[PDB]
Design a binder for this molecule. Sequence first.
Ligand code: COA
Ligand code: COA
Lengths: 206, 201
Amino acid sequence: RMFSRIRLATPTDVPFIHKLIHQMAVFERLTHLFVATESGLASTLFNSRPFQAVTVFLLEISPSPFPTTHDASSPDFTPFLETHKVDLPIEDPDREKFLPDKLNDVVVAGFVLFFPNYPSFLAKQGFYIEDIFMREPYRRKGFGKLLLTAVAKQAVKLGVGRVEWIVIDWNVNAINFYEQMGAQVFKEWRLCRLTGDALQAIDKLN
Amino acid sequence: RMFSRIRLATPTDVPFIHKLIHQMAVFERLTHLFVATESGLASTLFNSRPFQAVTVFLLEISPSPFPTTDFTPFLETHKVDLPIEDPDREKFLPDKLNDVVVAGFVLFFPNYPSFLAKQGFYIEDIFMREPYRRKGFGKLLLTAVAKQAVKLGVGRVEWIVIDWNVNAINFYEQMGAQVFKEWRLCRLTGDALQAIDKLNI
Ligand SMILES: CC(C)(COP(=O)(O)OP(=O)(O)OC[C@H]1O[C@@H](n2cnc3c(N)ncnc32)[C@H](O)[C@@H]1OP(=O)(O)O)[C@@H](O)C(=O)NCCC(=O)NCCS
Ligand SMILES: CC(C)(COP(=O)(O)OP(=O)(O)OC[C@H]1O[C@@H](n2cnc3c(N)ncnc32)[C@H](O)[C@@H]1OP(=O)(O)O)[C@@H](O)C(=O)NCCC(=O)NCCS
């Protein structure tokens, strides 16, 4: 029997966020683009109230109950706490890198990083999910479903009209998860990008 | 000679923004998804400072110079080859008695290229009305966004395109954008979100 908590990330979680994004870059065959540093994440992730700009939920797992929220401090968000019967003991070789406190038995298992977007045809704010990821030892136990559900629940609270993200078409396992969650994966849309260098080249135009 | 100005939108520009998004929906053959109202735009576009959240630049054209000018409007001038026939002109005048016409727009907001660990921008809409295309104005709109990006330390700008929109793809590539083959868009609709929210966690 296992316990999960979905909570907002704080500055103390930067090492875990950094490592999770790195794992994403490995999976997406894009380590050459991964230049993120802990210092860069610390400088950019926590300069607004949650949900108004870039926001992170972390999913934690423990064999012990978490402290109960009892009385909320937050106007917007209280952690989601759930109990689980999993059919298999978890072998997690990276556990030591994902402990918020090395003296407590709470492990960061996954995350979602998202921010407001704007579906213009609706004239409403939405959310965009930039990252959603469960570390390998914790997959196929319903945890990814909970991370996505947490975003949806916050979206409803805030009157969000749509959530979007992107996927590499060759990421079959992720696509299957998204489809089983009720997402549509479009055939026709393509991503366009101006890199930092491309931006500099335009800025030098007379 | 024609003169252009790229400026921030304000609440009085909502009619023009609404009509521009409608034209985008017609162009994209997605009018069935177009349910934006002027009311909705007014309530959602102007709740934060420019560049902190959803932001709109409008491109205006005039045969006369504009009054002398975080953000100052971008002003440009050149000699257009031949006169412009704009049948919708009367719907795009911020002042019905002055010769300044809204010709296009870009609607964008901060995003977060996580592999860079810094903010970027996403362009939700970039559009020139048909009478004003192929005259360099789209280039000016995208240039304005890129210049503001560099000023603010933005790491990357992204947007999406339909695969068979070869003319837009050509424009984007001419401006130095990469148009990727491998990425696909994923979506949960508002109704889907409501249903998912029935799970009491
Ligand atoms: C996409 C991702 C976030 C999903 O996270 P997850 O924790 O595995 O997701 P869940 O366990 O909630 O759902 C997985 C599936 O289990 C099933 N499932 C749902 N609830 C479940 C539960 N309580 N117990 C068991 N299975 C469950 C469903 O079939 C669900 O959909 P899918 O099989 O089509 O994917 C995760 O796989 C990931 O980070 N992937 C990126 C890396 C990757 O995909 N690598 C390639 C692997 S081959
Ligand atoms: C048209 C649009 C792509 C660009 O705006 P624009 O003002 O027309 O673009 P510019 O005049 O700045 O074009 C700059 C360069 O991009 C390329 N380009 C622009 N529009 C092009 C088109 N329709 N076909 C091919 N190349 C094009 C050219 O190289 C052009 O330079 P040139 O005119 O000296 O050859 C876009 O902003 C728009 O609103 N289009 C409507 C929706 C759409 O996707 N249309 C596609 C066909 S109109």
